[PDB]
């Protein structure tokens, strides 16, 4: 169920302006299959499950 700490790096990649859009899209498909659809769903789950998300707007 819970957000995993190494998945925080995935968030850094979705928020990397110069990161290959094909790579962001595989990460978004990965998160979609987990029920996390918008960037804010992803962050909010990370936060709900015990991680600091200041640094993400």
């Amino acid at each position: 169920a819970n957000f995993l700490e190494h998945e925080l790096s995935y968030i850094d990649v979705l928020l990397d302006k110069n990161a290959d859009q094909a790579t962001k899209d595989n990460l978004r498909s990965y998160f979609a299959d987990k029920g996390l659809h918008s960037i804010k769903d992803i962050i909010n789950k990370a936060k709900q499950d015990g991680f600091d998300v200041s640094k993400y707007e």
Binding site: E5, H6, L27, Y30, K34
Partner: protein
């Protein structure tokens, strides 16, 4: 589900095409003999007071442990012909094969008791009661906590209760990769097309990868060192953190995966992430089969049983059941007899390593922090190669670090793992000793004297009859480990049968067995024949001198060690298409 696949599924589905659930995860254990419950359906023997098994009171598991398993631990007999790595491989292997879910303490809310804190015997709890005059638990209203393993068909007592294997029965390195699709992808590096497994992002081990951290609601690892706040690790199997020795072997294979995928990407640059992962996973899976069947199992069974129960491989046979038998979950716990009371850690030169070279196991359970903050996995892995295993002997069965102090640091009391073993075979409705003897074609003793003869130890036989009344009632783990060891093996005939039977079925009934036609090319199979555990250690650690083959026999430094130079590396050239 297709009919020209080339890689295993994560769940084990579709290995047996005629019956695609055989060996798949989260299904009931096969039963090799019908279950034996107090009420014929689900109540474990011991559950109802005054209800005898075959005319005799049920012995408290803890009393059996106290009177039969307990011995002065400083008198332990080192095993001259096995390393501690022989113990650690059996634990890690077993975590490829079987895991039996139990319910969460938080399912206690509203309903039943918290099995962790109450001694009340109501579902789902089956607490171990305390005999009078126990050496440690002096309050007879106390108990050793115990959760009943989950029923595989929750419902209405009409069917006989059975239990669930949460893992792929196949020797497929599920301990590394997951037996479930969401876990398996959580274990993956999904931020690129390199085919890697995820690694820790806050820590490394002298530049080398550590397992990622798991996120548990009640993380036991954090409790072993309050200030360090190092949580448990994330792996294919939920127990990777139980002991840093085990963590070390999980971390070894994690790196071997990524090293393999790295080579395979240099060799075939057009392969995408999925294909890199699957191909490395395939190699890593055969390495586990090879180490297991070539190096480890001959030294469990010894030559005679190795030939009887594991003849030369022919080919795949889709009519054999590859499932894990319920009894194996308990019989393969023979290895608790090999366990030393200390975690041993050694340096560059195989000398005792500071801070703490000799740590009681009861300060090592779930101590994730010692891997991260006390030197990584090299000192642990040297300790495993250059320390003897404990020898199982009929009056030195198991050490008190696991019998008095199991998980002491993360529970309200130390548990007793042998006692847990016997309570667990009762939970699982396993038949007694003589019924497994019969199943194995072995004489069944009925009298103290006849038990004496089978064990070649009249005194152990008297103690066993004192506790149990009849050899029919002896719990399978207890009787199995009480037997004299076969020549050049570490089990008696009973456990040799059970264990060897199980592994034959896992090999002969595995469509992806590494020697079966079509799985690997002829050349790939001649390359894989070279692999060894010492070489895997050489490729993924700072260790340049390792144990010589057979690593599970080698155990004294410097006598049984060689430089890594000596050892052929794995040649992946055959993968170049």
């Amino acid at each position: 589900c297709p009919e020209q696949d080339k890689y295993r599924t994560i769940t084990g589905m579709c290995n047996n095409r005629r019956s695609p659930t055989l060996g798949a995860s989260n299904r009931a254990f096969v039963r090799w003999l019908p279950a034996e419950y107090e009420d014929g359906f689900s109540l474990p023997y011991g559950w109802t007071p005054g209800v005898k098994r075959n005319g005799f009171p049920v012995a408290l598991a803890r009393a059996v442990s106290n009177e039969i398993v307990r011995f002065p631990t400083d008198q332990l007999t080192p095993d001259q012909e096995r390393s501690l790595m022989f113990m650690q491989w059996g634990q890690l292997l077993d975590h490829d094969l079987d895991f039996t879910p139990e319910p969460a303490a938080r399912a206690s809310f509203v309903t039943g008791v918290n099995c962790e804190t109450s001694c009340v015997q109501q579902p789902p709890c089956f607490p171990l009661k305390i005999p009078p005059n126990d050496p440690r638990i002096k309050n007879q209203a106390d108990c050793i906590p115990f959760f009943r393993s989950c029923p595989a068909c929750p419902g209405s007592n009409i069917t006989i209760r059975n239990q669930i294997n949460a893992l792929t029965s196949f020797v497929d390195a599920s301990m590394v990769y997951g037996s479930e699709e969401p876990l398996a992808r959580n274990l993956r590096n999904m931020s690129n097309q390199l085919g890697l497994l995820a690694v820790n992002q806050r820590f490394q081990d002298n530049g080398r990868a550590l397992l990622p951290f798991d996120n548990l609601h009640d993380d036991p690892c954090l409790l072993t060192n309050r200030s360090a706040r190092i949580p448990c690790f994330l792996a294919g199997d939920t127990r990777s953190s139980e002991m840093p020795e085990l963590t070390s072997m999980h971390t070894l294979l994690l790196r071997e995966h990524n090293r393999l995928a790295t080579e395979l990407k240099s060799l075939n640059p057009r392969w995408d992430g999925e294909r890199l992962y699957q191909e490395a996973r395939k190699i890593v899976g055969a390495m586990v089969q090879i180490i297991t069947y070539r190096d480890y199992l001959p030294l469990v069974l010894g030559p005679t049983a190795m030939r009887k129960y594991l003849p030369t491989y022919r080919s795949y046979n889709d009519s054999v059941d590859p499932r894990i038998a319920n009894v194996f979950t308990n019989a393969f716990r023979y290895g608790h007899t090999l366990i030393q009371p200390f975690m041993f850690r050694l340096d560059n030169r195989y000398q005792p390593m500071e801070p703490n070279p000799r740590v009681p196991l009861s300060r090592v359970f779930f101590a994730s922090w010692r891997v991260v903050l006390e030197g990584g996995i090299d000192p642990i892995l040297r300790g495993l190669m250059a320390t003897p295993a404990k020898l199982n002997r009929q009056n030195q069965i198991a050490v008190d670090e696991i019998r008095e102090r199991l998980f002491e640091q993360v529970m309200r009391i130390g548990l007793d793992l042998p006692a847990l073993n016997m309570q667990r075979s009762r939970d699982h409705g396993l038949p007694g000793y003589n019924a497994w003897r019969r199943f194995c074609g072995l004489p069944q003793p009925e009298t103290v004297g006849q038990l004496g003869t089978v064990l070649r130890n009249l005194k152990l036989a008297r103690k066993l009859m004192e506790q149990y009344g009849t050899p029919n009632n002896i719990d399978i783990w207890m009787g199995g480990v009480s037997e004299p060891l076969k020549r050049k093996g570490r089990v008696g005939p009973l456990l040799a049968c059970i264990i060897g039977t199980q592994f034959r079925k896992l090999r002969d009934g595995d469509r992806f067995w590494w020697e079966n036609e079509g799985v690997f090319s002829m050349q790939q199979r001649q390359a894989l024949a070279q692999i060894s555990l010492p070489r895997i250690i050489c490729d993924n650690t700072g260790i340049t001198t390792v144990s010589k083959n057979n690593i599970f026999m080698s155990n004294s430094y410097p006598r049984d060690f060689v430089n890594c130079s000596t050892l052929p590396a794995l040649n992946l050239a055959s993968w170049r298409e």
